[PDB]
Structure 1
Amino acid sequence: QLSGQQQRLLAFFKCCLLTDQLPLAHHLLVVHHGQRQKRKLLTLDMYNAVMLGWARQGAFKELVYVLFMVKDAGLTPDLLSYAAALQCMGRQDQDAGTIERCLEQMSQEGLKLQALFTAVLLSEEDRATVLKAVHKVKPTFSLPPQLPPPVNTSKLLRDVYAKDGRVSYPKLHLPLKTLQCLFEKQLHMELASRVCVVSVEKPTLPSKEVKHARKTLKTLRDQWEKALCRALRETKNRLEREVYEGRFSLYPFLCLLDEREVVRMLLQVLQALPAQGESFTTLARELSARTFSRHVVQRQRVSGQVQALQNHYRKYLCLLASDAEVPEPCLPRQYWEELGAPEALREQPWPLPVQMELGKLLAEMLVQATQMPCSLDKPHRSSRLVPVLYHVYSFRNVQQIGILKPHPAYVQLLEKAAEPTLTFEAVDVPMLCPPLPWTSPHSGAFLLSPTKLMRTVEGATQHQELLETCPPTALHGALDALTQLGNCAWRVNGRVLDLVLQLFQAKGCPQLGVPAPPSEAPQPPEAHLPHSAAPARKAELRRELAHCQKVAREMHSLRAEALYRLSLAQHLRDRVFWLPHNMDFRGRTYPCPPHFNHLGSDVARALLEFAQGRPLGPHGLDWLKIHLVNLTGLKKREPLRKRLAFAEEVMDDILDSADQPLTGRKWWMGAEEPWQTLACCMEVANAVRASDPAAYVSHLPVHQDGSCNGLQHYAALGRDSVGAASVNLEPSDVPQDVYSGVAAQVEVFRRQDAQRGMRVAQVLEGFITRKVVKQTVMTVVYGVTRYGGRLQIEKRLRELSDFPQEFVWEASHYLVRQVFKSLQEMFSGTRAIQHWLTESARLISHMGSVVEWVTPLGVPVIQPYRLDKPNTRKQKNGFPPNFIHSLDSSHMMLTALHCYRKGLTFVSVHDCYWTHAADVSVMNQVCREQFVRLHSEPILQDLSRFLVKRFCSEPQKILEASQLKETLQAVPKPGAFDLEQVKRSTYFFS
C-alpha cells in the first residue's frame, strides 16, 4: 500500500513546482533525505518532480546534486528523471557531447528515448526542449506516427461509428460569429469565475432602517476582509516555518491562489452560506474545490493554453454552425480529436486527504478571522465582538464531526438589507457557449473549469480508476452521448417566466408550486404566557415552536432555491444557453448546473424550451395535443385517439387558459402538471392561430415516457408474457397502466390484512390512491434504501388531508412491503432476476470486494457503498436498482446517438425523453428499435460471465465463489413473449 505521508509529500512537491518556490522544495528535500526514516518515505517520483522543477529554472548543478541524493538513497533513475535532465541540458546550451554522453548512460540502463518519451507523460514545452536536445545530438528525432482515434466495435455502437453515407447530423441555428461572441462571453465568465445576477424578487423602496442595515452589511464585510487578509498572512508565515522545519505544509497551496482571491472567495462563501447552515466537512471540501478550480483557471491563463483553446474551439464551432460547412460531417468529439487540442497536465485533482486539510484550514481561518457583535453595532463598541460562524456538535463527544452555523444577527442583517445582487459560481450557472467535447472522462464540459465524469463524491476515486482501467474505445459512446446532450440549446420561455415572476413577487400559489414567503408561514401567535409559565407547558410550547420554525426554515430553503432558479431564468431569458451533462456512478445523465436545471422542478421544465426550432409538420399538432392530455393526466388508460378527441373537446378551455392564465377558467391549474400544461396550451394556441399548423415552429419539447422504465427492462430480460402486457411491451389497442394493477394487488393485500390483527391496513383503507402507489413503485425499483424516497411516500400520504398522520410512518413501511410483494407476484421474471442479483451481490460483498460490472455500452459501474469494506445490506439491496439504472442509461445513450444520426434534438429527463413534436414519431421508432437491440444481446449472461471473471476466480474464498458461480449459472429462462413485439407496440413510450 501507500501511506498518507507519500500522498502529502508528493502533493507538496508538485505544488511547490507550480508556485516557483524551488529553493524551499530543495530545503525540505534536503532535510527529508538527511533523516533515514524520512528518506524511506521519499519516493523516486518526488525526486523526479524536484529535478524537473529545477530543470525549468535553468539550474543543472542542483539537478546533479539531487542526483547524488538519488544514488545515495539507492534508487535507480527512471525514464522521467533522464528526460527532465535532458530537458535541462538544452537550456544551459552546453555542447552536444554532453547530450550524447547522457544518451550513452541511458543506453547502459534498459531504456530507449522514443519509447521513454512515449511511456512518460511530459509537458509540451518540456517535450519540445527534450526533442531539441536530441536534435543537437547525432540521433535524428525519428518520431513515430500517431494512432488514429479508434471507434467502438460493439454491436450496439457499430451503426453510429461506421459513418457510411447515411449521415444527417444537425447544426445549430445560430451563425458562427454569434457562437464565437457567446464563447467570448463564456470565457470572460470563466475567468472572473463570479456571475452577478439581479435578484428576481421585487425590491421595495428602502427604508431608513434598510439603508442603515446595508451600511452595516458593507462595513462588516470590509472588516471581515481585512481580518481575513491578516489571518492568511499569519498562516502563510507559520506554514513557511513548517517548510523550513521539514514537515508537510500547505504554504504552496495557499500561494497558488492570490491572497485577494482567497479573501474574496471566502466572503462569497459567506454570502452563499444559507441561514439553515452547512456541514463543516462539506464546506471544507467545497472551499478546496473552489481553490483548485480557480488555480486551474489561473494556470491555464498564464501558460497560454487558453488562447490555443480559443483557436481550437473556433475551428470546432465551424462544425456546429449552420452557415459554416464542413466537408466530412463527424461527431463533435471526433472533430475535436482531429484538431488535437492538448489536454492540460494540471486537470488532475490533488490527493483527497491534502484537499481536506487545505479546505479545513480555510474554513478554520474564516471562522477565527470573522467576528461581529451580536448587538449588530447599535451600541458604540461596548457589546462583545463574537465570531460570525459557530461550531455546532450534534453529539457532545469529539467522535461526532462538528458542523458550522451562521450568526443569527447576520442572517437578520441579510434579510433587512435585501440586497439585489446574487453571487453564483461559473460552474453553477449554465454555459453561454456549447460545452467542450468529452474527449476524455477527466476533461470535458466547462472549458476552463475541470469537470470530472463522476459527479458523485462518494467513491469518486475508485470509479474514476475503473474509468481509466476501461479501454477508451468503450467509453467513447457514453462520452459522445454526453456531448450530444450538452450541444442541445435551451431558451427560457418568456410568457411562463412572466407568470411565475408575477406569482413569486406577491404571495405565490401552493398548488402551482410557487413557494410561499416568510410572512405567509405559520408563525406562533404568542410567546409563553403567565398561564403557560408551568415548566411542562413551556416545554410543550418550545416543541411546537421547534416544529413551526422547522416548517418556516424549510419554506425559506424552498423559496431561496426558487429565487435562485428564477433569477438565473431571468438572467438567461434573452440569451441562448447550453446545459452541460455529467454522469453519476449509476451512469444516469444529470445536467451539471445545480441551481438551474430541467430535472429539478416542474416550473423549470415549463421555462425551458429548445432554442433550435423545428416545424410541426402534419403530425406535430396532434403530438402537441397528445402531450397536453398526458400533462393533465386525464385518460391515461385511454388510447391516443381518445386523448386526441378529448383535446378537441377541451380545446375551448385550452385557448382560454392560453389567452388568460390567471383571470381565465384556470383549467391548467387543475391539471397534474400545471405549468407544463400552460406552456403546451400556449404552443397549441399559437399553432391554431397560425394559418398553417405544419408551417408553425414548436420550440417546446414533447416528452415521451414509459410508465416505469425499470419494470420494462425487467420484463424484457425475463421475456414474460404477463409482464410485457402489464408494462405495454406487447402491442395493444388500449394501453394498460402497470400502477393500477399494483394498486389492485395492494388493495387485496389490504383487505386480507384488515381481517388480520394489524390495523395499518384499516388506517390506509380508501386512501391507497394510484399516484401514491406510483411513487411507491418508483421508490421500490429505482430507489435503494433511501430515506428520501420513503420520505417522499410519506409526503404523498401527508398531502391527503383525510389520511391521519399519526400512522404515516408505518403506513409508508407497509406500502413499501406490499408493493415489493405485489410486483414480485404479478411479474414472474422480475422476482427471479431481482433475487439472483441480490444473492450474487451479497456473496461478493461478504468476500470483501465491491460489485463491479460493465454496461452494454461499455462504461464500468461500481457501487460506492462503504461500511465503516462493502456494506452487506446496502450492496445486496443496491445491485438490482443500479444494474437496471445502467441498462436504462445505456438504452438512452443508444437512442440519443441514433437520433443524432437522423438529426433529431434529443435530451433525457428521468424516464421522459424530450424532443420536438415532429421528431416524436421518429424518436419513438428509434427508441423501440434500440430497446430491442439492447435486450437482443444476452445481458444476463454477459453480466454473469463478467462477475465470474472478476470475483469467482478468487483464491481467498473459492467455496463462496463456487456458490456465487452456481447462482450466476442459473440465469432466468426466457419466456414465450417475442422481443420483436416491442417495435410494433405504439404504447411502449407515450
Structure 2
Amino acid sequence: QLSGQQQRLLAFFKCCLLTDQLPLAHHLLVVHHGQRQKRKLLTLDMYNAVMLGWARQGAFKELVYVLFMVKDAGLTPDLLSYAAALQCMGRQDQDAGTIERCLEQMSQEGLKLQALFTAVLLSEEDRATVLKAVHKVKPTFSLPPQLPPPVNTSKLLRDVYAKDGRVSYPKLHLPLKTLQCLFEKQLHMELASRVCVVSVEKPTLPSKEVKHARKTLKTLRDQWEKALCRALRETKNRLEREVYEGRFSLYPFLCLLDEREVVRMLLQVLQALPAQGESFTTLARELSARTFSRHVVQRQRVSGQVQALQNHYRKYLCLLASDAEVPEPCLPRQYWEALGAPEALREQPWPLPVQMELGKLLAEMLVQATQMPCVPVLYHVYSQQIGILKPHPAYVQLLEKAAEPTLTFEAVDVPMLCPPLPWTSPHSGAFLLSPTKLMRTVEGATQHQELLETCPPTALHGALDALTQLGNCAWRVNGRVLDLVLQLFQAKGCPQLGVPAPPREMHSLRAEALYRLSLAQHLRDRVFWLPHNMDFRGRTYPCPPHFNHLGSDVARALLEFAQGRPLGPHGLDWLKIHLVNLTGLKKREPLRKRLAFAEEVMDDILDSADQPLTGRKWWMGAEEPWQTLACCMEVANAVRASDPAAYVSHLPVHQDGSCNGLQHYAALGRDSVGAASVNLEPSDVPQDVYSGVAAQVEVFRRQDAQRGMRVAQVLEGFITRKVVKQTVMTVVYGVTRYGGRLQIEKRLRELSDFPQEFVWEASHYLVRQVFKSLQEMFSGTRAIQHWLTESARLISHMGSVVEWVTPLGVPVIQPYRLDKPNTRKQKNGFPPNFIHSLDSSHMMLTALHCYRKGLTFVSVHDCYWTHAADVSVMNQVCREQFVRLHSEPILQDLSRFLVKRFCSEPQKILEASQLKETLQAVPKPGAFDLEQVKRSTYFFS
C-alpha cells in the first residue's frame, strides 16, 4: 500500500531508467533524503531503482553512495540491492576479493544466492552481468534447471488439463507460410500505431468549396502542429526546473517519446474527437494509454524484442497451421509458454495518479495551444455533471465540407491480421506489441487487477484459455451482405433496415456505421481475428471497438467464419432451424415444426437470397433481418451444391437459454417450477417463462388500473412477449444503469398504438411488476435474489465492497463506490453480477470442452455460436457443463468465502456477527434433479 505521492516518486525514478535521466532521479533521491519530513516518503524500492540505474551505467561510487543512503534512513539491503551491486561489479570486471566481501555480507544477514535469479525479476542483460560477477568466484553455477509449469487441478477444470490423450484440437485452415506473412502485416500495422482506411462515404468530385475546406483544414493542422510542439517544449522546460528544485514533475514521462510523436498523437486525438464531444477524464486516460502504448512499442523496437517475438510467434504458428504438426497435442497458452516465452518486461504501466496527471496535462495542452478564426478549437463543458470536451461547431462542419477520403484508426482499435497472442497472465496477451488488460472495467481497476495478480498460479487458466480460444476464431466479411449495406448506406441510408441515414444523435450512429463499414470494406478480402477481453463480472467482449461480431443485427450479418465445415448429415436441418429462429416467428414451436416451416417457406427463402430488395422481401419482416438474409443466402448455396452434405458452410449458427440467468436461479435453488419454465426439465415443446410472467404482470396491472393508476390503465394490451422479455432481462441483469430499461422504452416506442408520453413512466412500472412477478412465481429466484441483496446490503453497510470467486477460480469485485461503498448499487448489483459470473463460468466450460472435441466456438452476448455441422455436439457439451457447474456446492462455497472475507471485523463485531447470521442461512434447494438437463432439447435452442 503506497501513497499517491510515493507511487509517483517511484514511477519518476523508474521512468528515469528508460529516459537515461539518472542524475535527475538521483538529485530527487538526495533532496528528499535531505528533508527530515521527506525521508519517511523514501521506500527501499526507490533507492534500489536509483541503484539499478547506476549499476547499468557501471557508476560504482554513485551506487555505493545510495547504499550508505539506505543505512542512514534506517533500512536493510534486500536481494535487489545486492543485484545492483553485483551488476556494477560484473560490468566493470572487479577483483575476486571485492566481490567475495559483498558475497560474505549477503549470506551473513542472510540472503540466499540461488533465490536472486529465481524470485527477483531482472532483464536478460541484467541477469547475464550478475551471473558473470558470480562467475568471477569460479562456480559451479549449478542454477536449477527449468521447472515444469503446474496444471489446474480444480474439479471443474481437471478434465481440460488432464494429459489423457482423448483430445482432437482444431487447426486453422491456413498454412504456416500464409500465417507467417499475416503476422508481419500485423507487426507492421502495430509498429506504425495507426491504420489508414479508404472511406466508404461517396466522394463528391473536388468542388469550389471542397477544395477550399481541405485547404483551410491543412493550414489549421499545419498551424496546430507548430503551436503544440512549442507548448510541449515550454512545459518540458518548466517541469525540468521543478526537478532541479527537488520536486516531482511529469518531465521524465514527457521524455519517453519524440516531441514530434506526442504532437502527432495529440493531433490525431483532435481529429478523432466526436462532434458530440467526449469526457475529459476519458480523454486523459486515452492520452496516457496512447503515450504508454507507443512508448512500449518504441522500447521493444530498439531492445531487439521484436525479432525475439518474430522468432517465438513463427515457432508458435506450427500448432495453429494447417500444414504443420506439433510433437504432442497442446493448448495455445501451454505451447507459447513451453517454447520459452520472453516475458514482456516493459509490462509496468504507470500508477493511476501518474496516468491521470499526465493525461490531464496533455489534454489541457491540446486545448490551450489549438486555435482557429471565425478562437480555441476545444471547449470545456460540464454535462451528468461530468467534465466533457466538445469541439468547435464550425470546425466539425469544416471536416464535413472537406469530406476526407481517408479514415485513420489506432492499430489497437481494429481486428488483428494474424492469430492473437495467447493470454499468459492478466497483463499479457491479445495484441502483438501493445499492452492489453484481461479485465476492461475502469471503475476500481487497480483493486481488481491487483486481485488477479494476487492469484494462486494456475487459478486463472480456465479464463485465460477460453479468452485465447475466443480470440483464435478466424473471421471474414460476408461480401454479399456488405455490398447491399453499402448500396443503402451510400444512398441516404435505410433506417427501417437499421442503416443510419445522414443528418439529434444522428451523427454518432452514422459515423459509427461509417467507421465499421469502411473497415469491413478494407478487410473484405482478408481473414481477421478479434482478440477478447472480460469485464469485472466476466462478460466477454472483443478488444477492438470499431469492427466486431458484437453489436446490431447488421453488424452480426457482416461476419462469417473464415474456416468452413462440411454440413454433414444434419447441418442443412440446423441451417433451416437457425433461419426460422432468426425470424422470431415459430418461438412456441418444436424443432421439427420449425424445420417443416422452412420447407413450407423455401421459395421465399430463395427469393430473399436472389433479389433481396426487389423481390417479395420475406426476410425484411424477420425479428433479426440481416442475419435472416445472410441465412437465406447460405441455405440457397447448400441446396444448390453437388451434394448438400459436402457443402462447406461458413455461417455461424446460434443457441441460447432464452434467459440464461433464470436457468442459474432454477439450478441454484433446485426449483422444479422454475426449472420447468426455462427448459431445464425435458419437454417435447419449448416452455415460455414470459407467458407466465406476462399473466402475472396482468393481474397486478388490472388492480392498479381498477384504482386511479393511469400507467396501468394505459398498458392494457401492451403486456407483450417482447415487452416482458426485455423487462425480465432488465430485472435479472440490470444494475441501474438504465441500459436494459432504455431497451424497454424502445419496445414500447415500437408499439405505435401506445401513448409515447407514458413510455418512461411505464418502463419503471413494468420493472416493478416483473420483479414482484418473478418472486411470486419462482422460489429459487425469490430466496436467492433476497439472500444475495441482504448479504451485499450488510457487507456494504460495514464499509466494504462485495467480492467473491467464481466456481472457475476467477476473483470478482463490485467496484461501486461513492464519489466509500455505494450501498444501493452494491446490493442491487450483487444478484445480477453474481448471475453474470455464472453465465461466464458456463460459457468458459462449454468453450474449453468444445475445443477438446475440435469445434469452433464463440460467445456473442447471451449466445453460443458454432458451425451448422457441430450444433448437437455444442448442445451436448452445453448441457453437460451446466450440470457439472451446478453439481458443485456454489451457494455454500460462496457463503463460506463471504464469512471468511467479511466476518472477521473487531471494530464492527456485532454487525460482523449479524452478517455471519445472514450468510450462513444459505437458501435451501428444492427436489429438482439436475441430471434431467442433459436430456432437455429446449435447454439451449
Whole-angstrom distance in 1 between the partners of 2:757 and 2:578:
39
Query: What do the CA deviations read for 1:787-822 (whole angstroms, capped 9, x no partner)?
Result: 222222112212222211222221111000001011
**Equivalent pair of 1:348/1:442 in contact (CA under 8 Å):** no
Partner of residue 426, structure 1? 411
8 Å CA contact retained: 1:193, 1:294: yes
Please list the CA deviations of residues 301-325 of structure 1 after superposition, one character each: whole Å capped at 9, or x if unmatched: 1111111111111111011001001
Per the alignment, in what secondary structure is the counterpart of residue 234 of structure 1?
helix
| 1:941-970 per-position Cα deviation (integer Å, ceiling 9, x unaligned) | 111111111112332323222222222222
Question: Which deviates more from structure 2 when the two are superposed, residues 899-908 or residues 419-428?
Answer: 419-428
Give the alignment of 1:715-730 within 5 angstroms: 715-730=666-681
Deviation at 1:140, TM superposition (A): 2.7
| 1:704 Cα offset (Å) | 0.6
Residue 30 of structure 1 and its aligned partner are, at CA, apart by 2.3
Question: 1:536: how far off?
Answer: 29
Answer yes or no: is the 8 Å Cα contact 1:837–1:880 preserved in 2: yes
- What TM-score comes out, normalization by structure 1 length? 0.94
Q: Report how far residue 437 of structure 1 moved.
A: 0.8
Moved more, 856-865 or 144-153: 144-153
Equivalent of 2:632 in 667, 681, 694? 681
The superposition leaves residues 655-705 of structure 1 with CA deviations (integer Å, 9 ceiling, x where unpaired) of 000000111111101011010000000000001111211010110100011
Distance 2:477 2:710 in 1: 50
Equivalent-residue separation in structure 1 for 2:187 and 2:820 (angstroms):
44
What is the root-mean-square deviation of aligned Cα atoms in Å? 2.0
For the residue of structure 1 that corresponds to 2:517, the secondary structure is helix
Structure 1 segment 287-436 matched on structure 2, within 5 A? 287-374=287-374, 386-394=375-383, 402-436=387-421
Whole-Å separation in 2 of the counterparts to 1:737 and 1:639? 12
What is the 5 A alignment of 1:255-654? 255-374=255-374, 386-394=375-383, 402-516=387-501, 554-654=505-605
Offset of 1:401 from its aligned partner?
5.5
Shift of 1:460: 0.8
1:942 alignment partner in structure 2: 893
Q: SS where residue 494 of structure 2 aligns?
A: coil
Which runs of no fewer than 5 residues in structure 2 stay unpaired? none
Alignment of 1:848-859 (within 5 A): 848-859=799-810
Offset of residue 108 of structure 1: 2.2
Q: Distance in 2 between matches of 1:536 and 1:218?
A: 25
Partner residue of 1:661?
612
How far 1:118 sits from its partner (Å)? 2.5
Provide Cα deviations, 1:351-373, integer angstroms capped at 9, x if missing partner: 10111111111111111111111
2-structure distance, mates of 1:798, 1:750: 19
Uncovered stretches (5+) of structure 1, i.e. residues with no partner: 375-385, 517-534, 538-553
Contact 1:720 1:976 survives alignment (8 Å): yes
d(CA) in 2 for partners of 1:355, 1:586: 24
1:844-891 superposed Cα distances (whole Å, 9 cap, x missing partner): 111111111111111110111112221111111111111111111001
Q: Report SS of the residue matched to 1:70.
A: helix
Cα distance per residue 1:613-671 (max 9 Å; x no partner): 10001110000000000000111101001101100011000000000011111110101
Separation in structure 2 between the aligned mates of residue 739 and residue 767 of structure 1, nearest angstrom: 13
Deviates more, 1:979-988 or 1:73-82: 73-82
* Corresponding residue SS for 2:816: coil
Structure 1 position 2, deviation (Å): 3.0
Q: Give distance in 2, aligned partners of 1:506 and 1:609.
A: 25
Q: CA deviation at 1:68?
A: 2.4
Offset of residue 902 of structure 1: 0.4
Deviation of 1:139 (Å)? 4.1
Matches of 1:645 and 1:882 in 2, distance apart? 40
1:723 Cα deviation from its structure 2 partner: 0.8
Whole-angstrom distance in 2 between the partners of 1:976 and 1:101: 73
Secondary structure of 1:15's aligned partner: helix
Q: Distance in 2 between matches of 1:754 and 1:34?
A: 77
Q: Contact between 1:797 and 1:808, CA under 8 Å: does it hold in 2?
A: yes
**3-state SS, counterpart of residue 618 of structure 1:** coil
Larger deviation, residues 961-970 vs 882-891: 961-970
Q: Given that residues 438 and 444 in structure 1 are in contact (C-alpha distance below 8 angstroms), is that contact kept between their aligned partners in structure 2? A: yes
Distance 2:783 2:386 in 1: 42
Q: Partner residue of 2:252?
A: 252
> How far, CA to CA, are the matches of 1:593 and 1:193 in structure 2?
14
1:387, distance to aligned residue in structure 2 (A): 1.0
Cα distance in 1 between the residues matched to 2:631 and 2:195? 32
Structure 1 stretch displaced more, 216-225 or 955-964:
955-964
- Once residues 745 and 773 of structure 1 are traced to their aligned partners in structure 2, the CA distance between those partners, rounded to angstroms, is 11
1:744, CA displacement in angstroms?
A: 1.6
| Compared CA separation, residues 988 and 400, structure 1 to 2 (3 A) | closer
3-state DSSP class of the match of 1:861?
strand
**Deviation >4 Å, runs of 4+:** none
Residues 459 and 864, structure 1, Cα contact 8 Å, conserved in 2:
yes
Alpha-carbon separation, structure 2, partners of 1:831 and 1:536:
48
SS at structure 1 position matched to 2:646: coil
Distance 1:868 1:270 in 2: 29
The answer to which of 146-155 and 417-426 deviates more is 146-155
Q: Equivalents in 1 of 2:739, 2:592: separation in Å?
A: 38
**CA deviation after TM superposition for structure 1 residue 72, in Å:** 2.2
Q: TM-score, normalised by structure 2?
A: 0.98
Query: 742-751 or 957-966, which moves further after superposition?
Result: 957-966
TM-aligned CA deviation for residue 402 of structure 1: 3.6
**Structure 1 pair 137–635 and aligned structure 2 pair: CA distance change class (3 A):** same
Output the CA distance in 2 between the equivalents of 1:3 and 1:944. 33
Question: 1:515 Cα shift?
Answer: 0.7
CA distance, structure 1, for counterparts of residue 325 and residue 705 of structure 2: 71
CA contact (8 A) 1:100 1:138 kept: no
Deviation at 1:32, TM superposition (A): 2.0
Assess, with a 3 A threshold, how the Cα gap between structure 1 residues 402 and 913 changes in structure 2: closer, same or farther: closer
Separation in structure 2 between the aligned mates of residue 794 and residue 166 of structure 1, nearest angstrom: 50
Change (3 A) 1:401 1:486: closer
* In 2: Cα distance, 1:940 partner to 1:892 partner: 19
The answer to whether the Cα contact below 8 Å between 1:836 and 1:967 also exists between their aligned partners in 2 is yes
2:75 is aligned to 75
Aligned equivalents of 1:918 and 1:180: distance in 2? 29
Contact 1:698–1:916 (CA under 8 A) maintained in structure 2: yes
Matches of 2:116 and 2:911 in 1, distance apart?
44
Contact 1:134–1:140 (CA under 8 A) maintained in structure 2: no
Shift of 1:138: 4.0
Give the Å deviation of 1:724: 1.2
Q: Secondary structure at the match of 2:425?
A: coil
Instruction: Give how far 1:514 is off.
Output: 0.3
Greater alpha carbon shift after TM alignment, 581-590 vs 759-768: 759-768
Cα distance in structure 2, aligned partners of 1:581 and 1:276? 28
Deviations 1:247-279 (A, max 9, x none): 111111011011111011111001100100111
Question: What's the secondary structure of 1:970's corresponding residue?
Answer: coil
Q: Secondary structure at the match of 1:55?
A: helix
How far residue 390 of structure 1 moved from its aligned partner, in angstroms, is 1.2
Separation of aligned partners in 1, 2:187 and 2:116: 37
Distance in 2 (CA, whole Å) between partners of 1:619 and 1:246 is 75
Alpha-carbon offset, residue 400 of structure 1: 5.8
Do 1:96 and 1:136's aligned partners in 2 also have CA atoms closer than 8 Å? yes
Residue pair 1:707, 1:738 contacting (<8 A) in 2 also: no
Aligned to 1:901: 852
Q: Which residue of 2 aligns with 1:191?
A: 191
SS of structure 2 residue aligned to 1:439: strand
Aligned residues: 941
Secondary structure of 1:444's counterpart equals strand
CA shift for structure 1 position 186: 0.4
Q: Distance in 2 between matches of 1:74 and 1:979?
A: 63
**Could you tell me how far 1:200 is from its partner in structure 2?**
1.1
Question: What displacement does 1:494 show?
Answer: 0.5
Deviations 1:480-501 (A, max 9, x none): 1111111110011100000001
Provide the rounded CA distance (Å) in 2 between the counterparts of 1:492 and 1:96: 66
* Cα offset, 1:972, TM superposition: 2.3
2: CA distance, partners of 1:61 / 1:314: 45
Check whether the contact 1:720–1:975 (CA below 8 A) recurs between aligned residues: yes
Separation in structure 1 between the aligned mates of residue 219 and residue 237 of structure 2, nearest angstrom: 28
Contact 1:308 1:341 in 2 (8 A): no
Compared with structure 1, are the counterparts of its residues 536 and 495 closer, same or farther at alpha carbon in structure 2 (3 Å cutoff)?
closer
Shift, 1:422, TM fit = 0.9
- How many angstroms does 1:8 deviate by? 1.3
Distance in 2, Cα, partners of 1:438 & 1:956: 41
Aligned to 1:978: 929
Partner of 2:883: 932
Q: For 2:293 and 2:66, locate their aligned partners in 1 and report how far apart those are by CA, in whole Å.
A: 32
Structure 2 Cα separation of the partners of residues 85 and 59 of structure 1? 10
